[PDB]
Structures are given as C-alpha cells and as structure tokens.
Design a protein around this ligand. Structure first.
Ligand SMILES: CC1(C)[C@@H](O)CC[C@]2(C)[C@H]3C(=O)C=C4[C@@H]5C[C@@](C)(C(=O)O)CC[C@]5(C)CC[C@@]4(C)[C@]3(C)CC[C@@H]12
Ligand SMILES: [Zn+2]
Ligand SMILES: [Zn+2]
Lengths: 182, 170
C-alpha cells in the first residue's frame, strides 16, 4: 500500500509521519508571516483599506535602513498606548503579517520582489477567509484590485486569487463552501 | 512618516469578518516536513487533502488540539478552513524523488517572502531543545545585535523566527 511515489503519500504514510506535540510546545503560537515590500504607501493602503487589516505597529531601523509594519485582524481599541506594552501585545497576536520595507526600493524602477510563484518557486500565497467570495471580490473589482483568478474562472468556482501591490498572491475563500469546490 | 495617510483606520464593515486563514509554502517531501512541524515544533496536522487530477496534496497544520477536529470530511474541511493562522504545505507529487529539485526560501536573490514566525515562552529553552533534536539554525539566540532571538530552518530551508514577544519589547 505505499503509493508509487509519483502518486503522493497515502494517508497512512502521512499520518505516521506525525507525532503528538511535546508539552513544552504548548503555548507556542504561529505569530507572523514576513513579506518584503517595495513601497510601504501602496502596501499599507492595500492591506488596511482594501483588505481591512489594522496596522498594529511600525518599527524603525535607521541604522540598517529599514522598517517593519505589523498588521492583523484586530480591534484598534485593543492596541496599547504605551510603547513596551504595545510591542508585547503586537508580538503576541496570532496570525500577523509583517511587511519589511528596505529604504529606497520605491524609487528604484529597476527593483521588484519575487512572489514565489515562478521559478524559483517556494512561498505561494497567504489566504483570507471571507463569508462571501463573490461579494468581497465584487468590491475588490470596484476598488481597483488586480486579480490572478476571478471567483468564476476555472473549475474551482467560488474561490479567488488577487495580487497585492508587490505581486504577492492572496487567496480569497469561503470556509463553508470549500468542500463543494474541491 | 509620510505614510501618514496610508493607514485606513476603521476598515469598511464588509471586511469585518475577514480572517487571516493561511500561509502557503511548497514542500519537497512531506515525510520530513510533517515530522518537523509536528514533532519538533508541536503543530497538529488538521487535514490532508489530495488532488489526483492535478497531482498535488495539501497539508494543513496549525496549533490546535487534535480532539477538536471533526472526523467527517465535510465537517473537517469546513473546520480546517475557518481556523486562524494555519500553514498550508503544498506537495507536488514526485519532488521527493527528484534529486535535482529544490524550493527557494526567499532570502537570497530573488528575495520576497522572508519567514514565518513562532512566539514562545522561553526562546532559550526552546532553542536548546531544538539543538538537541538536530535542528539547523540560521541564527542562534546568542549571535549578533539581537540576543534572545533565533531563526531556524525547516526541511526545505524556510526560515522560522523563534521569538519572545516580551523581549522584543526590550
Ligand atoms: C546573526 C546575524 C547577526 C548575522 O549572522 C548576520 C545575518 C543575520 C542572520 C541577519 C540576516 O541574515 C538577515 C536579516 C534580514 C534583513 C532584511 C532587511 C532583508 O534581507 O530584506 C529583512 C529583515 C531581516 C530579518 C533583519 C535581520 C537580519 C539582518 C538578520 C536576521 C539579523 C541577524 C544576523
Ligand atoms: Zn519577522
Ligand atoms: Zn492556499
């Protein structure tokens, strides 16, 4: 029953590669995903205004000439005012997006970041779960967002991919509708 | 900062139930990857989904109690895809037997994606356990200006930040 190896893993092989978690890893949290961004204006506007994330915090590194922007689906009225307080909070949020701006890249017409979906491949995308793919995407269209895959294109109806201003892919999906699609 | 106007306070309420569900990474060999993320890092495999017509599988991992996972495929799928902060590891069939194939981690030419990041109670003991389990480090907690902060690598070489949120605070 181990599959032909041009056929992928059986459930058995796969599951048997899984161990229950060591109890010292309880309380571990998947806190952030870092993406490099060419232009923090385009990017902050895309993630806050279009996608509805809240800018939790900005960190500056004047020596090393770069800034970090931390965004998440969080209530602004939860963001601490105090500096240290604010940082501990931000960095204890789950499911956060860290955007790294290297100074000057916005003026560099020669410069662009690679989105991982052409050679050499790796990272693919982040994805947002929404209650209605078609209504969200209709608004995205209204707001000038660029699409990789419209919700109705292809076999997978009801799932979409849009680009952020650096070309990074963002999946848009409805958890109550995925099982129909697959 | 002249990005002063770039931050839309009060997002449109149509986005109020939006949720950052997944980060997707391509993996050469899920036997290694699954072992690493579960046994070393302590995540749980939520769901394995296969696509024969398209020759790939998806492995969703998260920090979730295995006991909360519905057993039924439709209930499971709906549950998995509504969890916050999942890793979606994509396996294109055969890459584990292709001696010439490897994925790129985004941290050298051409750059883009940098890393995912895991918050822990105690960076030092986590990293000592990591050392004991033969985990490869990109940065030990005691190298450079940033002390008490580490980066490790998964089996594909993707970078994973190991931090304590109360120590960046300093
Ligand atoms: C151990 C030491 C002291 C040393 O061995 C040099 C390499 C390094 C491992 C180093 C690295 O390699 C890449 C980056 C990145 C550069 C940057 C701006 C980018 O490359 O885009 C993105 C942010 C990021 C993570 C900031 C921190 C550093 C400087 C990072 C981890 C700090 C720790 C550092
Ligand atoms: Zn980071
Ligand atoms: Zn995905």
């Amino acid at each position: 029953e181990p599959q032909p190896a041009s056929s992928g893993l059986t459930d058995e092989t796969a599951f048997s590669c899984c161990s229950d978690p060591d109890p010292s890893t309880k309380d571990f949290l998947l806190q952030q995903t870092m993406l490099r961004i060419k232009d923090p204006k385009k990017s902050l506007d895309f993630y806050t205004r279009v996608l509805g994330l809240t800018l939790l915090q900005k960190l500056d590194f004047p020596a090393m000439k770069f800034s970090l922007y931390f965004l998440a689906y969080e209530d602004k009225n939860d963001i601490p005012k105090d500096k240290s307080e604010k940082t501990a909070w931000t960095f204890s949020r789950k499911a956060t997006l860290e955007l790294t701006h290297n100074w000057g890249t916005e003026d560099d017409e020669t410069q662009s970041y690679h989105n991982g979906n052409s050679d050499p491949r790796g990272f693919g995308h982040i994805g947002i779960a929404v209650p209605d793919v078609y209504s969200a995407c209709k608004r995205f269209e209204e707001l000038g967002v660029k699409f990789v895959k419209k919700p109705d294109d292809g076999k997978m109806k009801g799932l979409a991919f849009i680009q952020d201003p650096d070309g990074y892919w963002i999946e848009i999906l409805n958890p109550n509708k995925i099982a129909t699609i697959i």
